[PDB]
Design a protein around this ligand. Sequence first.
Ligand SMILES: CC(C)NC[C@@H](O)COc1ccc(C(=O)NCCc2ccc(S(N)(=O)=O)cc2)cc1
Ligand SMILES: CC(C)NC[C@@H](O)COc1ccc(C(=O)NCCc2ccc(S(N)(=O)=O)cc2)cc1
Ligand SMILES: [Zn+2]
Length: 257
Amino acid sequence: HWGYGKHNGPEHWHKDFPIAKGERQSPVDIDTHTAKYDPSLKPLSVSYDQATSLRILNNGHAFNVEFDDSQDKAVLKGGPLDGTYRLIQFHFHWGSLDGQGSEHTVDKKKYAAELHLVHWNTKYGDFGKAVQQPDGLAVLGIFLKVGSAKPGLQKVVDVLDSIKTKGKSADFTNFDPRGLLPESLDYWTYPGSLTTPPLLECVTWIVLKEPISVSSEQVLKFRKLNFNGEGEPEELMVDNWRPAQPLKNRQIKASFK
Ligand SMILES: CC(C)NC[C@@H](O)COc1ccc(C(=O)NCCc2ccc(S(N)(=O)=O)cc2)cc1
Ligand SMILES: CC(C)NC[C@@H](O)COc1ccc(C(=O)NCCc2ccc(S(N)(=O)=O)cc2)cc1
Ligand SMILES: [Zn+2]
């Protein structure tokens, strides 16, 4: 099945998921001089104070922190969005080396990792319906650079030993995702897709301009996870990122001058 290796990686995905060559695929390179400021874009509204985290899962491609999305608890509104989008899960993509790991790039620059806070449009009733709609999902993307530690990330880092291999999960209640946000909410936005199979073209991407900084030790602990299941040959979970895809007939808009 699909993955990130030489024989099942991003260049192979189109054989099972032909939309991989579609008209609104993600990620993309963000050319900062070509993005256009849109003064009609509204400020993002990130309302995470009532968030209810449940569990953390190694799914064989990344690790997901899952939330209770059966009521309006942690929601994203405003910006380019119409309506209310509920937080379902967050996860990361990261590299084997500090100079790679992000999916989006900025003037061709790669960051060490990228956080994806995944939300779905409540007008579609459930997440499975939302992925079938062109405005079904909103993913808030946040770049990570290596520098000082991010204190709000450490509780995630410290549970990773309990979910080393594919299929392992652990309780993960009372986690506050506000501790993963940078100071500024300035953003770029464009219509795109899921960056893993099934690659559905259902995402309004909102990518923050300001990265967060994490320590060497924090990212090193990401790199100790395994793609494989327990008792299978060990393959380190690193370089789980899709490279930039053609922009095609799309304009990236900026919320800031
Ligand atoms: C349990 C509550 C609290 N939260 C979890 C909830 O948000 C997940 O909701 C879902 C998730 C999946 C479905 C569903 O219909 N699955 C069958 C079709 C289906 C399969 C795979 C995907 S994927 N790989 O893009 O995410 C999406 C839909 C329907 C609802
Ligand atoms: C009917 C069954 C099969 N569904 C129940 C059970 O399998 C769980 O269902 C699901 C299915 C999927 C999810 C879920 O989180 N899917 C994420 C799909 C997804 C989301 C975001 C990205 S990215 N890199 O663009 O941000 C990529 C893939 C959550 C629950
Ligand atoms: Zn992702």
